[PDB]
Amino acid sequence: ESADLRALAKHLYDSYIKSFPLTKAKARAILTGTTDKSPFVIYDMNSLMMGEDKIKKEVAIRIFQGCQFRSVEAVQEITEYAKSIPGFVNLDLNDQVTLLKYGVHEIIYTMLASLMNKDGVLISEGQGFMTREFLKSLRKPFGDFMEPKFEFAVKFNALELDDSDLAIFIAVIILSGDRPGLLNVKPIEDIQDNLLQALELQLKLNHPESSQLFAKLLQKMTDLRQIVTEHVQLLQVIKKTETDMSLHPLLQEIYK
Ligand SMILES: CC/C=C\C/C=C\C/C=C\C/C=C\C=C\[C@H](O)CCCC(=O)O
Secondary structure (H helix, E strand, C coil): CCHHHHHHHHHHHHHHHHHCCCCHHHHHHHHCCCCCCCCEEECCHHHHHHHHHHCCCCHHHHHHHHHHHHHHHHHHHHHHHHHCCCCHHHCCHHHHHHHHHHHHHHHHHHHHHHCEECCEEEECCCCEEEEHHHHHCCCCCCCCCCHHHHHHHHHHHHHCCCHHHHHHHHHHHHCCCCCCCCCCHHHHHHHHHHHHHHHHHHHHHHCCCCCCHHHHHHHHHHHHHHHHHHHHHHHHHHHHHCCCCCCCHHHHHHCC
16 A cells, blocks of 8 residues: 555654754755845855854864764764664664664765755854865865765755655665674565655655656665765875874764
8 A cells, every 4th residue: 555655754754854953945945045044154264263253273174073073963863863763673773773883974965965055065054154165175185075075965966855755765775784784684674675665656756757766866875875985085094194183982983
């Protein structure tokens, strides 16, 4: 019955709204311009300092540290959303951790796209907007830190997916039965099968005129992996040239 799939889709979308304060709908509203949600833009040094005063230690590293914090924040959000996925908490505690460890970043960059356009990205819950040109001008090796993300966002945002779609998709990402070290693989794949069935109906009903979106979308998981890898490298480079820089223990744990 497809009525069981629609019901599953609604459960997931409902938890998605409850687990993420800044949705794509809100982001897009802000990005396309209103008066109350008009963001402050940061494109240079002055505006940066000006922003630290209106939005609420060298520029590059100080900024990068913000990224860390935010990432940790997102993880917490994703972790809580994972629990609402039917069957997920019923799995071996070890596997629950495995799926989270690997799936967390691919989900961070997927949702990050919602906050990006070709010229920049929203920060601090939509309160601010930092230009891609500023980030790209940062000091090596932090200048080439965000470029891969912007590249993906532009390509991915072209699918024109909305929140209700993204919720089933990140559910599928988490429930991947091919993660390194999964003890009990079968029960996991059984859940993804169902999720995939929800995403397939969801997309067809929500994007009737959009040919083979389901396939196009599933392909993007390829781009996501690439993004994660490149990051791990660069991240390992910062480690050596910046031995005086911290790293949240939760993030260090995920990269082993
Ligand atoms: C208060 C905000 C200050 C600086 C943030 C500026 C840009 C953040 C925009 C996107 C980053 C969001 C999440 C994380 C992105 C990075 O890719 C994570 C880097 C840390 C890591 O994952 O190892």
